[PDB]
């Protein structure tokens, strides 16, 4: 670690928001990604719920967590990390 601050590599543990194509949110732990394959993996993550394109029969929340989920970047079209600090 010869720079104190860094901006390519993403900080591990780090929680972010990803959409996947199917207008739904997730969040989860960042645990490991692949630049070269595309791909990434979160561990520890929840899903908030399907209802703006969900279907019109009703679904139940989900509110059991994923310990892993593996995405591929052609699956979910955006992804943002969250920043949590304090000002003076």
Same mark, same amino acid.
């Given at each position: 670690?010869?720079?104190?601050?860094?901006?390519?590599?993403?900080?591990?543990?780090?929680?972010?928001?990803?959409?996947?194509?199917?207008?739904? @949110?997730?969040?989860?732990?960042?645990?490991?990604?692949?630049?070269?394959?595309?791909?990434?993996?979160?561990?520890?993550? @929840?899903?908030?719920?399907?209802?703006?394109?969900?279907?019109?029969?009703?679904?139940?929340?989900?509110?059991?967590?994923?310990?892993?989920?593996?995405? @591929?970047?052609?699956?979910?079209?955006?992804?943002?990390?969250?920043?949590?600090?304090?000002?003076?």
């Amino acid at each position: 670690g010869a720079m104190a601050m860094s901006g390519g590599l993403p900080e591990l543990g780090s929680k972010i928001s990803l959409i996947s194509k199917a207008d739904i @949110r997730y969040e989860g732990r960042l645990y490991t990604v692949d630049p070269q394959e595309c791909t990434i993996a979160l561990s520890s993550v @929840r899903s908030f719920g399907t209802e703006d394109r969900d279907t019109q029969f009703q679904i139940a929340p989900q509110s059991q967590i994923y310990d892993y989920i593996l995405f @591929r970047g052609s699956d979910i079209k955006d992804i943002r990390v969250v920043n949590n600090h304090t000002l003076p």
